[PDB]
Amino acid sequence: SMRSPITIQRSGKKYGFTLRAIRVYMGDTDVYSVHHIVWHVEEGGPAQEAGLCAGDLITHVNGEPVHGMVHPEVVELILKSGNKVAVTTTPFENTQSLV
Amino acid sequence: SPITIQRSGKKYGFTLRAIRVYMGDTDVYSVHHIVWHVEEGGPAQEAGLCAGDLITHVNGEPVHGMVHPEVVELILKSGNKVAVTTTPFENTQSLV
């Protein structure tokens, strides 16, 4: 909403990040919504240089909300954007624990 | 049904992260606990735990409303056996 988008520019076919879909279920029911997480950012790629990090969730593609959209629809939004894309993400995180 | 994991060493061989799940176009969100990594050949992998799984319960105790260090502490205090309730991962990914 009020979160600042990350602008990425590519010279080749890809932005250099992997998008994974995750299912977020409501309580103990079979009801879920699909969310889009940055699973990997290629070292030295356009997304890494722009500040995108593995673990960031993408909430918007060029200001358009993606909450609920299926994985191929979000991939299509990024694909149709051209060689420049604006992604809105979750705020920066770097906390994890090996258990 | 929960995934029961048993460890013979110090760790279960999985990494936990906390993620914010925002609602639509708003700044409203809920905190979820994701299995970020599962070590190949470790206890969690052998028990069937997968990277991308979301953890909803630890030994039947719901983790909704808990922060990352509290969930880590539940797993630590469980000792060498832990039962984790998850919601499925999806090996749905694309290189973009």
Which among A15, A32, A95 has the least Cβ separation from residue B96? A15
Q: Which residue, among B93, B41, B33, has the nearest Cα to B67 in the 3D structure? A: B33
Q: Is A19 on the interface with B (CB under 8 A)?
A: yes
Domains of chain A: 1-99 (2.30.42.10)
The reported resolution of this PDB entry, expressed in Å, is: 1.9
A50 contacts A78 by C-beta, under 8 angstroms: no
Type of residue at B35: V
Method: X-ray
Locate tokens 């940055």: which residue? A38
Please tell me the distance from the alpha carbon of residue A97 to that of residue B14, in angstroms, as a whole number.
Answer: 9
Strand segments (E) across B39-95: 54-58, 61-62, 81-87, 93-95
- Cβ neighbours, 10 Å, residue B68: 18
> Which chain B residues in 50-89 lie under 8 Å from chain A, judged by CB atoms?
52, 54, 56, 64, 68-69, 72, 75-76, 87-89
Tokens of B40: 């190949």
Locate tokens 């719901």: which residue? B62
CA angle A33, B31, B42 (to 5 degrees): 90
Locate tokens 């206890």: which residue? B43
B56 contacts B87 by C-beta, under 8 angstroms: yes
Tokens of B7: 């460890």
Distance between start and end Cα atoms, chain B: 35
Please tell me the distance from the alpha carbon of residue A16 to that of residue A14, in angstroms, as a whole number.
Answer: 5
CA dihedral B37, B48, B90, A36 (to 10 degrees): -30
- Give the list of residues 6+ apart from residue A29 with CB closer than 8 angstroms, or none: none
Our CA-based measurement puts residue A21 at a distance from the nearest CA of chain B, in whole angstroms, of 6
Please tell me the distance from the alpha carbon of residue A2 to that of residue A59, in angstroms, as a whole number.
Answer: 12
Q: Is A91 on the interface with B (CB under 8 A)?
A: yes
CA angle B74, B78, B83 (to 5 degrees): 90
Q: Which residue, among A50, A37, A45, has the nearest Cα to A11 in the 3D structure? A: A45
Our CA-based measurement puts residue B9 at a distance from the nearest CA of chain A, in whole angstroms, of 11
Distance between start and end Cα atoms, chain A: 34
Tell me the C-alpha to C-alpha distance, in Å, between residue A69 and each of A65, B24, B32, B33: 9, 10, 19, 21
Please tell me the distance from the alpha carbon of residue A23 to that of residue A4, in angstroms, as a whole number.
Answer: 25
A36 contacts A58 by C-beta, under 8 angstroms: yes
